Design an enzyme around this catalytic site. Structure first.
Site, PDB file in Angstrom:
ATOM      1  N   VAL A   1     -31.441  42.999 -27.384  1.00  0.00           N
ATOM      2  CA  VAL A   1     -31.520  43.664 -28.797  1.00  0.00           C
ATOM      3  C   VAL A   1     -32.746  44.139 -29.278  1.00  0.00           C
ATOM      4  CG1 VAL A   1     -30.528  43.536 -31.136  1.00  0.00           C
ATOM      5  CG2 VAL A   1     -29.817  41.809 -29.511  1.00  0.00           C
TER       6      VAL A   1
ATOM      7  N   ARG B   1     -40.927  53.398 -28.250  1.00  0.00           N
ATOM      8  CA  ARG B   1     -41.498  52.642 -27.115  1.00  0.00           C
ATOM      9  C   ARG B   1     -40.570  51.598 -26.609  1.00  0.00           C
ATOM     10  NH1 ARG B   1     -44.954  49.250 -25.509  1.00  0.00           N
ATOM     11  NH2 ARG B   1     -45.623  48.476 -27.608  1.00  0.00           N
ATOM     12  N   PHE B   2     -40.324  50.611 -27.766  1.00  0.00           N
ATOM     13  CA  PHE B   2     -39.476  49.374 -27.565  1.00  0.00           C
ATOM     14  C   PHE B   2     -37.867  49.786 -26.866  1.00  0.00           C
ATOM     15  CE2 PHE B   2     -41.581  46.119 -30.677  1.00  0.00           C
ATOM     16  CZ  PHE B   2     -42.745  46.610 -29.991  1.00  0.00           C
TER      17      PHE B   2
ATOM     18  N   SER C   1     -32.823  44.433 -37.661  1.00  0.00           N
ATOM     19  CA  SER C   1     -34.351  44.391 -36.788  1.00  0.00           C
ATOM     20  C   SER C   1     -34.935  45.600 -37.258  1.00  0.00           C
ATOM     21  CB  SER C   1     -33.821  44.406 -35.206  1.00  0.00           C
ATOM     22  OG  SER C   1     -33.699  45.444 -34.693  1.00  0.00           O
TER      23      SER C   1
ATOM     24  N   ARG D   1     -25.864  49.112 -32.825  1.00  0.00           N
ATOM     25  CA  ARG D   1     -25.436  48.342 -33.871  1.00  0.00           C
ATOM     26  C   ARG D   1     -25.691  48.991 -35.052  1.00  0.00           C
ATOM     27  NH1 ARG D   1     -27.009  41.976 -35.550  1.00  0.00           N
ATOM     28  NH2 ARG D   1     -29.248  42.709 -35.571  1.00  0.00           N
TER      29      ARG D   1
ATOM     30  N   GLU E   1     -20.096  36.302 -37.873  1.00  0.00           N
ATOM     31  CA  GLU E   1     -21.151  35.813 -38.451  1.00  0.00           C
ATOM     32  C   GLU E   1     -21.137  35.709 -40.015  1.00  0.00           C
ATOM     33  OE1 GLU E   1     -24.404  38.665 -37.636  1.00  0.00           O
ATOM     34  OE2 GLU E   1     -23.481  40.262 -38.528  1.00  0.00           O
TER      35      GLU E   1
ATOM     36  N   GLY F   1     -23.194  35.213 -34.318  1.00  0.00           N
ATOM     37  CA  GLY F   1     -24.404  35.594 -35.013  1.00  0.00           C
ATOM     38  C   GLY F   1     -24.753  34.403 -36.267  1.00  0.00           C
TER      39      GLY F   1
ATOM     40  N   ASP G   1     -27.163  34.649 -39.639  1.00  0.00           N
ATOM     41  CA  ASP G   1     -26.198  35.299 -41.054  1.00  0.00           C
ATOM     42  C   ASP G   1     -25.099  34.123 -41.057  1.00  0.00           C
ATOM     43  OD1 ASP G   1     -27.151  37.759 -41.904  1.00  0.00           O
ATOM     44  OD2 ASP G   1     -26.738  38.707 -40.021  1.00  0.00           O
TER      45      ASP G   1
ATOM     46  N   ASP H   1     -36.119  38.348 -38.304  1.00  0.00           N
ATOM     47  CA  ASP H   1     -35.349  39.461 -38.429  1.00  0.00           C
ATOM     48  C   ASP H   1     -34.616  39.185 -39.975  1.00  0.00           C
ATOM     49  OD1 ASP H   1     -32.825  38.318 -38.295  1.00  0.00           O
ATOM     50  OD2 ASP H   1     -32.062  39.813 -36.984  1.00  0.00           O
TER      51      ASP H   1
HETATM   52 MG   LIG Z   1     -26.683  39.306 -37.794  1.00  0.00          MG
END
Ligand SMILES: [Mg+2]
Ligand SMILES: [Mg+2]
Ligand SMILES: [Mg+2]
Length: 684
Positions: free
Chosen positions: A114, A121-122, A231, A295, A394, A419, A422, A593
């Site tokens: 993720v 860049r990432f 994120s 996402r 989640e 998840g 969360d 995050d």
């Molecule tokens: Mg989550």
């Protein structure tokens, strides 16, 4: 600077991005597009708002119910959840029908990266993380201890020897690999069919290994989630459009980014697919890139990137999840098409686009997501069913209705994933009034979380996911602690998860080793039919007993939580950075995050509500942790310290407000406060 597009008043930056960059090459008439988008918004907004209202109404009822029932009558509780429509009947067994899905998802078990979509860049590195050097991963991490400037041969040798030992596991000799004197069917100076090619390419458990003759490359991040949600920080049309443009670029396949280091610049680009000679002398082409998911945000938030006329509102901010489906869907057409205007590379080989949908509560909310996707496909001229959905499991109302949630998306689901961060946040908020909750670290060993993880897999396999859709588990947050990850994370594939979340390309390469060690298909087959969790287990609220904690334990939790909220929020608010490595009170570097925030703030909010701690304790801890965070950020010239003028720091006030008002945030969600505070910082 808004363009009137019928009932939509669109921020120009968004309007121009769509018309100038995204639409051409899709064959979608621009006027038809905006008109059709207007109509989706008009038709689906009331249901979106209605779903959110149901959330609030259910939570109000549960809060009230706990007022006097404070303990525990499990039967009465469960029947109450039934009576209010929180717990719904389980449908009968079924098998999902989702088709047109790529092999990365149906046929392969392995890591899933993720990454924040806002960082080009990432993102590029993430997409290129489908292949990585095991040698670099070993040498560059603590997986090889420093025990006993320039290359260090005694380390390189340990690296070589580790890979060797890995080779004996994944592609065993007839009769260790160490003793090999050379290579030429393959010969070395157990299963011969694991030789698939050369340019030497091996395959084990459906994953490739390449020995350079020197280095061992592992097919690593099989899939990658390009994240618009937890994120990233994106609070206006400027930020959203940055995100959409990167996503557009990945799907065209021409996203590039300049990287300047040591007075030199190289441009980061997407990798080509990879050709090999097959042993029969034929040709094999393998994907060079991770299969991309996106996402989107969930159903809660609205965005002023579009203001809306009509319906029940007055220039109402548009629901963000609606526009994400539209704009991420639109950009992704280029990842399917092969005309001149669609760029050099495609994503899916099978005509699908993959959207992860987070933070859904219950089957009606899954049905609404599917209708959104259906309506978007209509505007876009994508065949119905092209937008497939990765369901995050989640939220408690989803976990407890999971089989119905999957059935609601039986024709579109390509994964479920636990998840867990969360999910714990929701667990705390939902039962906020029940009493004080156990510590964050005690949650790992709770009855509910164990049933949550196991149920997810059981229900998945029972719905016929094996061979059709992933069953995923959660993120490894400790980015420097790779010896621990290599040791611990093997648990997820051993639990029948065909994928689990990793934080970086290097972690993807190391986690891939686990899928060579564990035959997830055979593990899944042994799990088939088993029923390992119950509704009564899931409904076991993780309340702390009395005399649970010596005062030092309480204090360690408070400071730990405040440092983590502060470390993450200060970068969020002051820099618009949504995924930060943040050192906890025990030193360790974590991937914080938004969900890590949800957990910490809700736990503190819960302890305040039940008098485990005071408002005064919270302020005191925040003030004490501020300068520790300032100190951690000191060598960063973009950083501005929070101390000593705590009440003049918007970041600090944002962390304080998340805790002190945490009990009032819908389902404990951090966005309303964080979006507000980021906008305030930008306008300052
Ligand atoms: Mg989550
Ligand atoms: Mg393309
Ligand atoms: Mg491709």
């Amino acid at each position: 600077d808004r363009v009137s597009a019928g009932n939509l008043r669109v921020a120009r930056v968004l309007y121009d991005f769509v018309n100038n960059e995204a639409l051409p090459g899709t064959d979608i008439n621009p006027n038809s597009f905006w008109s059709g988008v207007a109509k989706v918004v008009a038709d689906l907004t009331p249901q979106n708002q209605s779903l959110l209202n149901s959330r609030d109404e259910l939570q109000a009822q549960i809060d009230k119910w706990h007022r006097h029932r404070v303990i525990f009558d499990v039967d009465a509780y469960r029947q109450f959840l039934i009576d209010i429509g929180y717990l719904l009947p389980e449908p009968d067994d079924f098998t999902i029908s989702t088709s047109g899905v790529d092999d990365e998802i149906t046929m392969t078990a392995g890591p899933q990266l993720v990454v924040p979509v806002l960082n080009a860049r990432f993102a590029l590195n993430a997409a290129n993380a489908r292949w990585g050097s095991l040698y670099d991963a070993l040498y560059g991490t603590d997986t090889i201890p420093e025990t006993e400037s320039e290359y260090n041969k005694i380390r390189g040798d340990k690296v070589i020897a580790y890979a060797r030992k890995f080779m004996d596991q994944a592609v065993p000799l007839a009769s260790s690999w160490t003793n090999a004197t050379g290579v030429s069917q393959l010969q070395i100076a157990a299963s011969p069919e694991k030789f698939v090619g050369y340019n030497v390419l091996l395959a084990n458990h459906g994953l490739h290994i390449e020995v350079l003759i020197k280095d061992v490359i592992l097919e690593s991040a099989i899939t990658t989630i390009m994240d618009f949600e937890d994120s990233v920080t994106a609070v206006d049309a400027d930020d959203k459009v940055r995100g959409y443009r990167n996503w557009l670029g990945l799907n065209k396949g021409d996203l590039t980014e300049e990287v300047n280091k040591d007075g030199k610049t190289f441009t980061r680009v997407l990798n080509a697919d990879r050709s090999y000679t097959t042993p029969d002398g034929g040709e094999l082409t393998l994907p060079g890139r991770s299969l991309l998911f996106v996402r989107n945000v969930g159903h809660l938030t609205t965005s002023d990137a579009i203001l809306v006329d009509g319906g029940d509102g007055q220039e109402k901010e548009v629901f963000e999840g609606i526009i994400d489906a539209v704009f991420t869907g639109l950009a992704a057409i280029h990842g399917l098409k092969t005309g001149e205007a669609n760029g050099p590379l495609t994503n899916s080989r099978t005509g699908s686009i993959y959207i992860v949908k987070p933070k859904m509560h219950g089957p009606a909310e899954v049905a609404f997501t599917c209708e959104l996707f259906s309506r978007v496909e209509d505007v876009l001229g994508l065949p119905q069913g092209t937008l497939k959905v990765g369901i995050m499991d989640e939220e408690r109302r989803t976990t407890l209705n999971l089989k119905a949630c999957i059935k609601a998306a039986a024709d579109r689901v390509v994964f479920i994933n636990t998840g867990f961060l969360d999910r714990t946040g929701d667990e705390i908020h939902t039962s906020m009034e029940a009493g004080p909750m156990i510590r964050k670290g005690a949650m790992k060993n709770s009855t509910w979380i164990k049933a949550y993880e196991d149920a997810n897999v059981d229900i998945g396999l029972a719905a016929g996911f094996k061979g059709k859709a992933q069953i995923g588990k959660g993120m490894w947050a400790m980015t420097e602690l790779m010896a621990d990850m290599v040791e611990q994370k093997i648990g997820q594939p051993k639990a029948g998860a065909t994928t689990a979340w990793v934080p970086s390309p290097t972690a993807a390469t190391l986690h891939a080793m686990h899928y060579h060690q564990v035959d997830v298909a055979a593990v899944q087959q042994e799990l088939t039919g088993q029923r390992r969790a119950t509704v009564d287990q899931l409904l076991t609220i993780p309340l702390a007993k009395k005399l649970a904690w010596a005062p030092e334990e309480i204090r360690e939790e408070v400071d730990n939580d405040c440092q983590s909220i502060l470390g993450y929020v200060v970068r969020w608010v002051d820099q618009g950075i949504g995924c930060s490595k943040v050192p906890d009170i025990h030193n360790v570097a974590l991937m914080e995050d938004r969900a890590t925030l949800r957990i910490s703030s809700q736990l503190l909010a819960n302890w305040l509500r039940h008098g485990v701690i005071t408002s005064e304790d919270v302020r005191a801890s925040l003030e004490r942790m501020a300068p520790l965070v300032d100190q951690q950020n000191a060598e960063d010239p973009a950083y501005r310290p929070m101390a000593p003028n705590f009440d003049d720091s918007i970041a600090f006030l944002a962390a304080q407000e998340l805790i002190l008002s945490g009990a009032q945030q819908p389902n404990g969600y951090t966005e309303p406060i964080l979006h507000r505070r980021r906008r305030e910082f930008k306008a300052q």
